[PDB]
Amino acid sequence: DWPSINEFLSELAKVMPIGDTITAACDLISDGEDAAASLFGISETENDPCGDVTVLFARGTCDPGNVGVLVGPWFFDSLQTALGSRTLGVKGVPYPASVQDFLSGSVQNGINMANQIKSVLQSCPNTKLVLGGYSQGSMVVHNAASNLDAATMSKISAVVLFGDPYYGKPVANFDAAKTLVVCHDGDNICQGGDIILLPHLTYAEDADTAAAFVVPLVSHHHH
């Protein structure tokens, strides 16, 4: 039902406003993602109950829904495949993913995500919780970790960030050995910029590698 990553990227190439700043590209990115989602049957909103593994995912600036189409869905499918029989529940982070918060620092969004993390840990104390972010969503994850103590962050199994605008900064109050940051060569966002270039839109290619990073970190008996 879903296309291959190659077919997915070729369809995006027809509409994505490559070379524009996020401000100039915002509405075209949102429309392009929505059109690809409708064409391919890819969900841009996730609100599952906790699974054996649960991912809290913060989407990119101007991405539709609560997970977008570019990266999140591919990462969830790869992770579910890598988990075999174990179930994966995905919950999108309900924040605006606005241009202004990207340009400012997305900080109250970090506090809200820190509350969502605390709430999921209380509601699902037996799930293996993984945090994921793309673009501004990676800033939200960084800010959530900055607002949590090391004892709470110790309850997180893994963190995966794609196209991190804070690339180079570690995830606060957390073991860096449990973090994977995927930042493509030539992605202007990872350089602290605001230009949307092709390397920022192709993180679906890293879904399998990101899933492989997570799997060893989500065992109930590996301490």
Give the CATH number of the domain where residue 33 resides. Answer: 3.40.50.1820
DSSP string, 78-116: HHHHHHTTS-EEEEE------HHHHHHT-HHHHHHHHHH
CB 138 within 8 A of CB 59: no
Domain that holds residue 77: 1-223
CB 44 within 8 A of CB 37: yes
Q: Give me the resolution in angstroms, 1 decimal.
A: 1.5
Residue 187 designated active-site: yes
How many domains are contained in the chain? 1
| Candidates 157, 194, 200, 206; catalytic one | 200
Instruction: Look at residues 79, 82, 52, 55 and name the one whose alpha carbon lies nearest to residue 67.
Output: 55
Tokens at 174, concatenated: 């957390």
Residue 160: how many CB atoms within 10 A of its CB?
Answer: 29
Angle between helices 107-123 and 136-146 (to 10 degrees): 70
CA distance 26 to 30: 6
Residue 30 designated active-site: no
| Candidates 101, 164, 187, 194; catalytic one | 187
CB 166 within 8 A of CB 139: yes
In angstroms, what CA-CA distances link 30 with 23, 27, 37, 51, 214?
12, 5, 11, 29, 29
CA distance 181 to 203: 11
Question: Which method, experimentally, gave rise to this model?
Answer: X-ray
Strand-pairing partners, residue 55, are 90, 130
Tokens at 182, concatenated: 């995927």
For the chain, the distance separating the N- and C-terminal CA atoms, rounded to the nearest angstrom, is: 39
Tokens at 3, concatenated: 């296309």
Instruction: Look at residues 193, 72, 82, 69 and name the one whose alpha carbon lies nearest to residue 134.
Output: 72
| Candidates 135, 138, 157, 206; catalytic one | 135
Residue 200 designated active-site: yes
